[PDB]
Amino acid sequence: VRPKITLACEVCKHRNYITKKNRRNDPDRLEIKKFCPNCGTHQPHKES
Amino acid sequence: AHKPVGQNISEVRRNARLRRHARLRKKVAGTAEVPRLVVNRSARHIHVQLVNDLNGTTLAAASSIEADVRAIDGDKKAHSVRVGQLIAERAKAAGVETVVFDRGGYTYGGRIAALADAAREAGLKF
Amino acid sequence: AELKITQVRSTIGARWKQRESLRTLGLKKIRQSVVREDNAQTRGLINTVHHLVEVEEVG
Amino acid sequence: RNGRDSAAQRLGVKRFGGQVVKAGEILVRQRGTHFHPGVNVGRGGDDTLFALAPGAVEFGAKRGRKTVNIVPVARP
RNA sequence: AUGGCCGAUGGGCCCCACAGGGUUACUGACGUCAGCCAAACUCCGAAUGCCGGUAAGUCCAAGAGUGCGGCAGUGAGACGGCG
RNA sequence: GUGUAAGUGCACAAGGGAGCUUGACUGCGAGACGGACAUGUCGAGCAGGGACGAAAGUCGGGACUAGUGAUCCGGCACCUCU
RNA sequence: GUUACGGCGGUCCAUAGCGGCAGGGAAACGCCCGGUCCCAUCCCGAACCCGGAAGCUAAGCCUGCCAGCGCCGAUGAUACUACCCAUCCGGGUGGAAAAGUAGGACACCGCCGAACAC
């Protein structure tokens, strides 16, 4: 299934971005780099 | 009764070059103040023109055929560099400042890259 | 030239275009007559309602 | 079994030849690329053609494709 | 889909091997000289209608359009002419 | 052949392959389409900070049209609100 | 200004295409030689890229001629149709196809560049 999951920042740790993914294709916690507004730069967003 | 069975390699090369030049002409076009620098490269020479597509003319042109750029004893890359400088300040004389580089369906490297940076360092920014 | 146009049939049951063409010509009742010059617009108007009017040439 | 149908999508040409338009005005609403964008005409995510500059819509053909262009009407 | 022609494929029959085979009242693929058909076919393709521009007409009137506000009724239609 | 129904398209590829990458962004948005209303749809362009590319440039998910549920009520994270 | 020349573009992108016959290498366009260098193959210097000019116009290229296959295509007529007559049949004014035919067609135009005389 592709459940709704949340990607939080690393520095301030706000659960900003959400999206779906297959829990069996990528059971490991996702890692992607996205734009964080308040910090104003591009940092990776980690799963919760 | 000597009929070759298939296409010659020259025909295949010409058709492929024309097709992949046309495929890149989708995004590249030249205007009056932003003309298109189209380069044609052969095994012995190289040619460049400044084309304004909306009307279909050539503001400036340069090539290796002319004897002035024939005189340099340098290698083909050197000839391309000289041709790039020549097209650069010919365009300077033509009132053209900014251009778009049409590579003519060839890979951007070797002689083509050589005269590309030759034109770039001569003041024609693109 | 000039055209002499008179209405001979009523507008009852006529389509919207025919009623509007009759009004555009400038006649409202039966036996009413108008005089209009000979131009393409007038020919189109009379062609629209030729079954409701009679066209004589003046002079 | 039958009886299921979809709502009409109101596709087609919105601005016809000679009509003057403003920037960003939708010209045609289409599914495929039946009309291809021309000069001063863009293509949307759903193949919708919209005007990139004010002018008069002009329908033309290019290399066998029917295209839609915008004629830059003369300023008074 | 044919005037359905040849023509695959399978089956029987004849040889008898059951391998190899051939004969059709057999079964008989697709195709095609030519003629066909199609709302869910189109290399074509009108007439009307529709969108816009323009020039006129009506213009002591259509008692015309559009916007806003007050007050509604209607939201079970019938027949006739065309598709 | 285009992930998937059909239609409209795509051979200039939207079809096939490879390299890097996360724009499957934040604040917006002139002008429009469609509509009883609520919905819905397209969008050039501006700023920030990025990806790819030599560059011009393209990128606010997927060739497009289906894959979805208003309001109330409640949960979680942040806020220089009370 | 001229050449059987090389490029970049066009045109409601075949009237241009395909096919046959006959030619040429001045500069060019190519085929060609080799992989030392930039670069490359999901294997291959075949392709891409790089260095050269021994040979060849046999091909690409373009030139001339063929309607051969394709392509374009009238006029007239007709189908159909708007309005109006017409008790059905049908008729009047206007618009007017598709197919077919006569025919056209072996492209045209623009801007630079080569070689030549000025």
Domains and CATH numbers, chain C: 1-58 (3.30.1390.20)
Sole residue written with tokens 């050539």: B58
* CA A9/CA C8 separation, integer angstroms: 88
Q: Among B44, B45, B40, B46, which residue's Cα sits nearest to residue B17?
A: B40
Largest separation between any pair of C-alpha atoms in chain D: 62
* CA C54/CA C40 separation, integer angstroms: 17
Question: Method used for this model?
Answer: cryo-EM
Angle between helices B111-121 and B76-93 (to 10 degrees): 40
Residue C39 CA, chain-centre distance (Å), reads: 13
SS3 C40: helix
Query: What subunits make at least 3 CB pairs under 8 angstroms with D?
Result: none
Decide if C17 contacts C50 (C-beta within 8 A): no
Q: Among D62, D56, D34, which residue's Cα sits nearest to residue D47?
A: D34
Query: What subunits make at least 3 CB pairs under 8 angstroms with B?
Result: none
Residues with Cβ within 8 Å of B68's Cβ and at least 6 positions away in sequence, in order, are: none
Sole residue written with tokens 């009679």: C54
Task: Identify residue B82 by its one-letter amino acid code.
Answer: R
Distance in angstroms: CA B59, C1' E83: 63
Resolution of the coordinates, Å:
2.7
Q: Which residue is nearest to nucleotide E53 (CA to C1')?
A: D18
* CA B117/CA D39 separation, integer angstroms: 32
* CA B121/CA B81 separation, integer angstroms: 10
Backbone angles phi, psi at B87, to 5 degrees: -65, -30
Return positions of chain F under 7 A from a protein CB: 7-10, 12-14, 21-27, 30-35, 41-44, 48-50, 54-57, 61-65, 76-78
Q: Residue D63: which region, alpha, beta or left (left: phi > 0; alpha: psi -120 to 50)?
A: left
- Classify residue C47 as exposed, middle or buried by CB count within 10 Å of its CB (0-12, 13-18, 19+): exposed
* CA B25/CA B33 separation, integer angstroms: 18
Decide if B51 contacts B57 (C-beta within 8 A): yes
- Classify residue D11 as exposed, middle or buried by CB count within 10 Å of its CB (0-12, 13-18, 19+): middle
D54 touches strand F (CB under 7 A): no
CA distances from C19 to C7, C29, C35, D57 (A): 12, 11, 19, 35
The residues facing C57 across adjacent strands are C3
* CA C51/CA A24 separation, integer angstroms: 81
Alpha carbons within 13 angstroms on the beta-carbon side of residue D13 total 13
Helix (H) or strand (E) holding D24: none
| CATH (one of 3.20.20.150, 1.10.10.10, 3.40.50.10490, 3.30.420.100) for B27-126 | 3.30.420.100
* CA B39/CA B29 separation, integer angstroms: 13
* CA D23/CA D40 separation, integer angstroms: 9
Distance in angstroms: CA D22, C1' G28: 51
SS3 C42: helix
* CA B90/CA C18 separation, integer angstroms: 72
